[PDB]
Every structure is written in C-alpha cells, then in structure tokens.
Amino acid sequence: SWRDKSAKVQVKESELPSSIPAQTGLTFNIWYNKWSQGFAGNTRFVSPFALQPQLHSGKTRGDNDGQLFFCLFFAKGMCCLGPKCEYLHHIPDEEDIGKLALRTEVLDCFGREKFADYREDMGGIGSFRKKNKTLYVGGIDGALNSKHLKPAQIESRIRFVFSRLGDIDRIRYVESKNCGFVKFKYQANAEFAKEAMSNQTLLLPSDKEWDDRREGTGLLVKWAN
Ligand code: NA
Ligand SMILES: [Zn+2]
Prior knowledge:
Layout: H1 26-36, H2 53-56, H3 61-64, H4 72-75, H5 94-103, H6 127-131, E1 134-138, H7 140-143, H8 151-162, E2 168-174, E3 179-184, H9 187-197, E4 220-223
Antiparallel strand pairs: 1-3, 1-4, 2-3
Zinc ion (ZN) binds at residues 71, 73-74, 79, 81, 85, 87, 89.
PDB class: splicing
Keywords: RNA scaffold, Torus domain, CCCH zinc finger, RRM domain
Assembly: monomeric
C-alpha cells in the first residue's frame, strides 16, 4: 500500500524547466505550454516523464495537513518534491472522492477551477462538464508506435493502462477513428487520468518496442463531448 510508503521523488529539479509554478492557476498552463513547445515537430511528443502508480505513490506533507487535492506534477510524473509535497501523491480512491464531494463543487481533483465553455443559469459551472466522467482518447496507433494489435487487444491495453488511475466504468475503441472512450466510475479519476495520460505512450515495459516509445506520438486526452 502507498499508505506505508513515502512518496518518491519522480524527477530532479534540474530535469525540469526553470521557474516551477503553483499548480492551481493559469501560470501552470503558460509554463507547461512553453515546455511542450520545446519539443520540435508538428505531431504530439511522447512525454519523457511518466507517473508510475505503484512505484511513486506514498505519503506527503499533504497527508498530514489534511490536503484534499492531488499533485498535478505527480500525475504527470514531474514532481520533484516527493515527501515534501503539500499535495497528495496517490491514486484517488473512495475516501478521497468522498471527501472531495463534500468540500467543493467548483474545483477539480487538482484544486483548479473546473472549466466549461459555458456557465449554468445563475450560475455555477457547465452542467455537462460537472457530471462528465468520460475521456476522449485520440491517436492510439501513434501511442503504440504502430505496434500491430487487434482491436480487442487495444481495448485490453487501454483498460489496463487507464485502470491503474481509477476504477473503469466503460471502454470503447473505435478502429475506424483511431480513438477510444474511457468512462470512469468517479469523476475525480477521470480528471486525474486526463492529466496523467496526456502525451503518454500506450506501450508497456513488457513490449519489445518499449525502448523506442518516444519514436511514436503522445496520446491526445480530452473530455468527450
Ligand atoms: Na497564478
Ligand atoms: Zn507533488
């Protein structure tokens, strides 16, 4: 269990761009976009950083301070703080989901304002965004490095990878569209998995293609419409 462990340092401060910002505001986006734009090319880069749920998860300062929000850097495999982090470094489970559902309505599992293209009538947040638990997952073939897997094996692969970030409700893979849909049982996991799987490979250390995973293209993960 993560509860008996201290969160591991994922990266050294020096492996990251200078001026590491807070995770809650739009400065994170500016910072992350600048980093994202340093990867040359028209196509989505495969991130050099990845969350390893079993290896990385553990207690942080947040667990002692009664923090409810998870670390955005942790989700992306980009946290240098480890046990020093004020935010949670584990996969959101029932306890966390329960706590979050009582504390806030307007903020996601990372403590960022939930964004919708529209607001409700006086005037919370967009109703569809509010209840959405389903992620659009695009560019599957690129994230596998064009590894030849059958549609059913691709479903199994997506299920296996996303299942490590929360309980799965439903998986659909559409071959003709090179895309899938991952519905989580809980929104918090969908929010977490969205940030965790952006620009990620679908390959596993068990594949012979694993070492060449950055030759492919990173996953596109968005909310489904
Ligand atoms: Na800010
Ligand atoms: Zn952290």
